């Protein structure tokens, strides 16, 4: 599986997107340089869930052992109420994920970028302390900061919420904008919670859980053997700990002790964009993916799986062009295999703000029932729960996905140019 | 209550029996239970108790004293003989309160002490007291001593080898060790305290044969094993010599059995009809629908038979309704408990099925909670019919739809 004609691809961002970015495209006969505005890379000290579509990817390009090493395997995902931590939904996770083909892990986020720095490193010409500032979109060139010109054949903007190359595909000034949701999030040592008899159970059976309450919800979950992560979603109005501990004062007495285990805090604004009319530049030499595209709020877990399936798409695409007439072409297939997906998945994440964040009353009292019961599509409901839900998010193979899209279609209409 | 005041004889004071008399006597009937045995009770051994069960203690207010003494299991897990590798899962708590009470693991002599609360002040209990004949017109029970005891209606409560039964229809392969274990010595192994802390019932599956397990009271880890029974207190040696091909945490369970109840299963295809023509005597519980207990809910349905008919006998009025009042319980009773017979019979198949195709693909159907040769406590169809099931309402919106028109017209 090589291209017959060989690209010069730019990759901004060096990012999980970028890392898998750089290996798909590398590994089919693409040169790939990576250009990265900051002076080192890695990932921030917090948790990432990484759902089957995701780790099916990762065990297929060999990686599932180092994954299996490092990350937990959650048994289910437990939502509860605020004030009391009454248990009031459960999602089968382990074998129930499984049956979608890989598993469902929690996993440190440094330990996911070092696993994909690993598959990426000997693909991708890394150059750090470049900040793309210009692009030349005809032939194309990335242009840094320092005025060096950059010369490729494609430009891939995986340049994040930030993403200087979104406003370059649509030529003119566009951003993700906040929220009004910020997080907290933390991480504190599985120790001093084995240590408590009330605390050990979330440590010794591993779930997801989910305190909702007003405004706010919890998650929380191990990453590792001595570390469990906390994230905390409340109203961003612009002691860091302090204040944490302090807006989620009504929570549950478990949750109080959880919380004076936290002795910092990445406070942390969510940014969403609505979706692109596009994500090519007309010109067809430059495109996007990962959070510079279809950045969401973070409530269904699946911006790092959206621009990982991006990459992948890219690279079983990208592995059949042999002439530099179907490279506009393929981006807009692109465009055509992914918009959707992540645009429903954008979707999920905004309906689980509304969800999660009820006030008492009716909705909470309705939700509460669906999520007891597991209600099926067939303030609303837990969607990992719903069976149609799962197989739509977690049983989606994007290799699978592009590949049944070239035999059905990319052959006819791109692969005689 | 009823404008009709009968005198009825049960014949049995089991769990079917108890409840019977509880559900009769409160509704103004006058009960007479006999018992051959000399002493009452029930063997050591756990039950699961589901929510059509539950939500009736809790509606017949000991609700507060089952809490007490049951445990609420979290899930229901389905594992393989040879790795105990989980191959499916039903969630229990909350998904199984859904349907209006809880699903609970119990000691069978905590449950029969409080069906016996319930009875007590409604039944005159006689021990010793073996029925060997019946009178069917009169009718009249007659005991092994010569006495006869008349009443107005007897139930046969008398369990798998009812007596009764003969009389009501006119003419004459798998058995489980069952064993308790103290759950100190499992929380003594780090491998095996995960079983106490964490509690769920326990199924491995294997070849012609399959464990369940659950926790039951603070000390106790109820454990059954089905296997082939080639035709009392049982060898604990031949019981581990007969699982010694099932996962090592498995052999470690069975090293702490001291002794073993042996247990001969029997199923029996559904009766024609439970009520003798004269309609004078009919039965309930194991005397007329006795199940493979493969779908724990031999005692749910004794208990629901019951609830019936207190329900339907609150109505009586006039000895003309007694025999179309007994084929009204039939009615309601017999499609029900032969459907869950046959859920019983399924699982034996899928449960013991040997290694190839058909166990791959029950895995993979319990894995995904396929919605047979699956996991039925995953399947939100199969819960709501029976879970949802509520035996009182069935009863009285057949009384409303049908009975009032039908059974006023005697
Ligand atoms: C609280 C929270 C929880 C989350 N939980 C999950 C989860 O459980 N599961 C999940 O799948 N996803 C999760 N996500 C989403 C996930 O973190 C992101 O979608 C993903 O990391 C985005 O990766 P990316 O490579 O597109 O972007 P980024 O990680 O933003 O990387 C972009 C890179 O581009 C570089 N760059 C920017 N501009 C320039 C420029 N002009 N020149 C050069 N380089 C530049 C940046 O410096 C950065 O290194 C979560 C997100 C949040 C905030
Ligand atoms: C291994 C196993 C596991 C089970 N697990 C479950 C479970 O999880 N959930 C569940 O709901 N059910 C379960 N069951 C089923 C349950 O135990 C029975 O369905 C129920 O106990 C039957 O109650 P009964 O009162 O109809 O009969 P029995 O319990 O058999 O009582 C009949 C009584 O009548 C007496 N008697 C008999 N003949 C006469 C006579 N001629 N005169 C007077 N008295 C007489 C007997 O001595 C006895 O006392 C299980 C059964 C088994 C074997
Ligand atoms: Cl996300
Ligand atoms: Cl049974």
């Given at each position: 599986?090589?291209?017959?004609?060989?690209?010069?691809?730019?990759?901004?961002?060096?990012?999980?997107?970028?890392?898998?970015?750089?290996?798909?495209?590398?590994?089919?006969?693409?040169?790939?340089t990576?250009?990265?505005?900051?002076?080192?890379?890695?990932?921030?000290?917090?948790?990432?869930?990484?759902?089957?579509?995701?780790?099916?990817?990762?065990?297929?390009?060999?990686?599932?052992?180092?994954?299996?090493?490092?990350?937990?395997?959650?048994?289910?995902?437990?939502?509860?109420?605020?004030?009391?931590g009454?248990?009031?939904?459960?999602?089968?996770?382990?074998?129930?994920?499984?049956?979608?083909?890989?598993?469902?892990?929690?996993?440190?986020?440094?330990?996911?970028?070092?696993?994909?720095?690993?598959?990426?490193?000997?693909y991708?010409?890394?150059?750090?302390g470049?900040?793309?500032?210009?692009?030349?979109?005809?032939?194309?060139?990335?242009?840094?900061?320092?005025?060096?010109?950059?010369?490729?054949?494609?430009?891939?903007?995986?340049?994040?919420?930030k993403?200087?190359?979104?406003?370059?595909?649509?030529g003119?000034?566009?951003?993700?904008?906040?929220?009004?949701?910020?997080?907290?999030?933390?991480?504190?040592?599985?120790?001093?919670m084995?240590?408590?008899?009330?605390?050990?159970?979330?440590?010794?059976?591993?779930?997801?859980?989910?305190?909702?309450?007003?405004?706010?919800?919890?998650?929380?979950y191990?990453?590792?053997?001595?570390?469990?992560?906390?994230?905390?979603?409340?109203?961003?109005?612009?002691?860091?700990?302090?204040?944490?501990?302090?807006?989620?004062?009504?929570?549950?007495?478990?949750?109080?002790?959880?919380?004076?285990?936290?002795?910092?805090?990445?406070?942390?604004?969510?940014?969403?964009?609505?979706?692109?009319?596009?994500?090519?530049?007309?010109?067809?030499?430059?495109?996007?993916?990962?959070?510079?595209?279809?950045?969401?709020?973070?409530?269904?877990?699946?911006?790092?799986?959206?621009?990982?399936?991006?990459?992948?798409?890219?690279?079983?695409?990208?592995?059949?062009?042999?002439?530099?007439?179907?490279?506009?072409?393929?981006?807009?297939?692109?465009?055509?295999?992914?918009?959707?997906?992540?645009?429903?998945?954008?979707?999920?994440?905004?309906?689980?703000?509304?969800?999660?964040?009820?006030?008492?009353?009716?909705?909470?009292?309705?939700?509460?029932?669906?999520?007891?019961?597991?209600?099926?599509?067939?303030?609303?409901?837990?969607?990992?729960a719903?069976?149609?839900?799962?197989?739509?998010?977690?049983?989606?193979?994007?290799?699978?996905?592009?590949?049944?899209?070239?035999?059905?279609?990319?052959?006819?209409?791109?692969?005689?140019?």
């Amino acid at each position: 599986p090589k291209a017959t004609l060989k690209l010069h691809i730019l990759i901004v961002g060096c990012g999980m997107g970028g890392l898998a970015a750089a290996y798909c495209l590398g590994r089919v006969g693409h040169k790939v340089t990576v250009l990265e505005q900051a002076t080192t890379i890695g990932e921030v000290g917090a948790g990432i869930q990484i759902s089957p579509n995701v780790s099916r990817l990762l065990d297929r390009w060999g990686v599932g052992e180092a994954v299996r090493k490092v990350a937990i395997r959650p048994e289910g995902m437990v939502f509860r109420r605020y004030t009391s931590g009454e248990v009031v939904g459960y999602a089968r996770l382990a074998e129930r994920m499984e049956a979608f083909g890989a598993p469902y892990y929690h996993i440190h986020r440094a330990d996911l970028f070092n696993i994909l720095y690993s598959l990426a490193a000997p693909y991708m010409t890394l150059r750090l302390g470049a900040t793309v500032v210009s692009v030349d979109t005809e032939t194309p060139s990335a242009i840094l900061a320092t005025g060096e010109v950059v010369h490729g054949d494609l430009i891939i903007g995986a340049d994040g919420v930030k993403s200087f190359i979104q406003r370059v595909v649509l030529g003119k000034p566009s951003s993700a904008e906040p929220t009004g949701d910020a997080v907290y999030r933390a991480i504190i040592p599985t120790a001093l919670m084995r240590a408590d008899p009330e605390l050990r159970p979330f440590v010794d059976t591993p779930e997801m859980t989910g305190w909702m309450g007003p405004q706010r919800h919890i998650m929380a979950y191990n990453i590792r053997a001595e570390e469990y992560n906390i994230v905390l979603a409340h109203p961003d109005d612009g002691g860091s700990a302090d204040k944490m501990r302090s807006d989620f004062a009504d929570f549950e007495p478990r949750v109080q002790k959880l919380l004076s285990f936290v002795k910092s805090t990445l406070k942390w604004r969510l940014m969403d964009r609505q979706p692109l009319e596009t994500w090519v530049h007309p010109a067809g030499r430059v495109t996007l993916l990962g959070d510079a595209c279809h950045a969401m709020l973070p409530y269904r877990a699946q911006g790092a799986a959206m621009a990982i399936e991006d990459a992948a798409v890219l690279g079983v695409l990208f592995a059949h062009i042999s002439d530099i007439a179907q490279l506009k072409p393929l981006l807009y297939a692109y465009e055509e295999l992914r918009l959707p997906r992540t645009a429903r998945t954008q979707g999920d994440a905004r309906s689980n703000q509304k969800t999660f964040h009820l006030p008492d009353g009716p909705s909470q009292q309705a939700r509460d029932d669906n999520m007891r019961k597991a209600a099926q599509v067939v303030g609303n409901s837990n969607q990992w729960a719903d069976h149609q839900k799962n197989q739509e998010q977690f049983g989606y193979d994007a290799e699978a996905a592009a590949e049944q899209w070239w035999r059905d279609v990319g052959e006819s209409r791109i692969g005689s140019y």
